[PDB]
């Protein structure tokens, strides 16, 4: 765009500076030249302003790029969708013309089953809650599992903790809680 503008007359007798100078005396050539100077000066100013604004956008992008590198390649991120969709594991950077490319490796839960649940389990009037995980039921038996992959386990005093009683918790169910100490002392 900038280049082509040179070919405009901006109302002078010619866009070609030498053609004005080779045909007019100074008192007349000056007038014609002023018309070209005005046009050309204006043209540069336009170009420069655009470049400044565009440069601003690039710098913002550069700052974001730098930030992913730090909190994503050098680390592991719990900011959601910051390092691709899924739960982030790790990332590898590769260079490219005028930028950077980021390969994110994530973890995506894949196949799933419908189970019945409860907030707490009653034992001897005590309310037992899971230390980690969820009380789940297969329809006949209660297990405790982690929240992200189905690993069912027997409900025991080493899986749960006790707080308060049966009369408070809404949706509390009855089951039994095994004590792993009992058979060690029993035998």
Ligand X SMILES: *[C@@H]1O[C@H](CO)[C@@H](O[C@@H]2O[C@H](CO)[C@@H](O)[C@H](O)[C@H]2NC(C)=O)[C@H](O)[C@H]1NC(C)=O
Residues near ligand X, by CB under 6 A: 122, 138-141, 174
Token look-up 């030498």 returns 18
User: Under the criterion CB under 6 A, does residue 63 sit at the interface with ligand NAG?
Assistant: no
Taking the complex as a whole, the smallest distance from the CB of residue 187 to another protein amounts, in Å, to 28
Q: Cα 88 to the chain's mean position, in Å?
A: 10
User: Under the criterion CB under 6 A, does residue 170 sit at the interface with ligand NAG?
Assistant: yes
User: Under the criterion CB under 8 A, does residue 81 sit at the interface with its own copies?
Assistant: yes
Coil vs helix vs strand at 95: strand
User: Which residues are CB-contacts of 108 (< 8 A; sequence separation ≥ 6)?
Assistant: 85, 86, 87
Q: Measured between alpha carbons, how far is 163 from 107 in angstroms, rounded to an integer?
A: 35
Could you say which of its own copies, ligand NAG, ligand X, none residue 117 binds, taking C-beta under 5 to 8 angstroms by partner kind?
A: none
Q: Are strands 126-130 and 134-137 parallel, antiparallel or unpaired?
A: unpaired
Position closest to ligand NAG via CB? 171
- Residues 96-115 binding ligand NAG (CB under 6 A) are 112-114
Could you say which of ligand NAG, another protein, its own copies, none residue 169 binds, taking C-beta under 5 to 8 angstroms by partner kind?
A: another protein
Q: Cα 138 to the chain's mean position, in Å?
A: 37
The residues binding its own copies (CB under 8 A) are 49, 52-53, 56-57, 60, 70-71, 74-75, 78-82, 181, 184-185
């Amino acid at each position: 765009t900038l280049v082509k503008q040179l070919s405009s007359n901006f109302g002078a007798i010619s866009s070609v500076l030498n053609d004005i100078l080779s045909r007019l005396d100074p008192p007349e050539a000056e007038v014609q030249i002023d018309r070209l100077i005005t046009g050309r000066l204006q043209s540069l100013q336009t170009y420069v302003t655009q470049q400044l604004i565009r440069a601003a956008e690039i710098r913002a992008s550069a700052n974001l790029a730098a930030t992913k590198m730090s909190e994503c390649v050098l680390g592991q991120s719990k900011r959601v969708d910051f390092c691709g969709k899924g739960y982030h594991l790790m990332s590898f950077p590769q260079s490219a013309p005028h930028g950077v490319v980021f390969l994110h490796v994530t973890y995506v839960p894949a196949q799933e089953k419908n189970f019945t649940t409860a907030p707490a389990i009653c034992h001897d009037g005590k309310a037992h809650f899971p230390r980690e995980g969820v009380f789940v039921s297969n329809g006949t038996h209660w297990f405790v599992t982690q929240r992200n992959f189905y690993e069912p386990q027997i409900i025991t005093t080493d899986n749960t903790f006790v707080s308060g009683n049966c009369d408070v918790v809404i949706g509390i169910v009855n089951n039994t809680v095994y004590d792993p100490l009992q058979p060690e002392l029993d035998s």
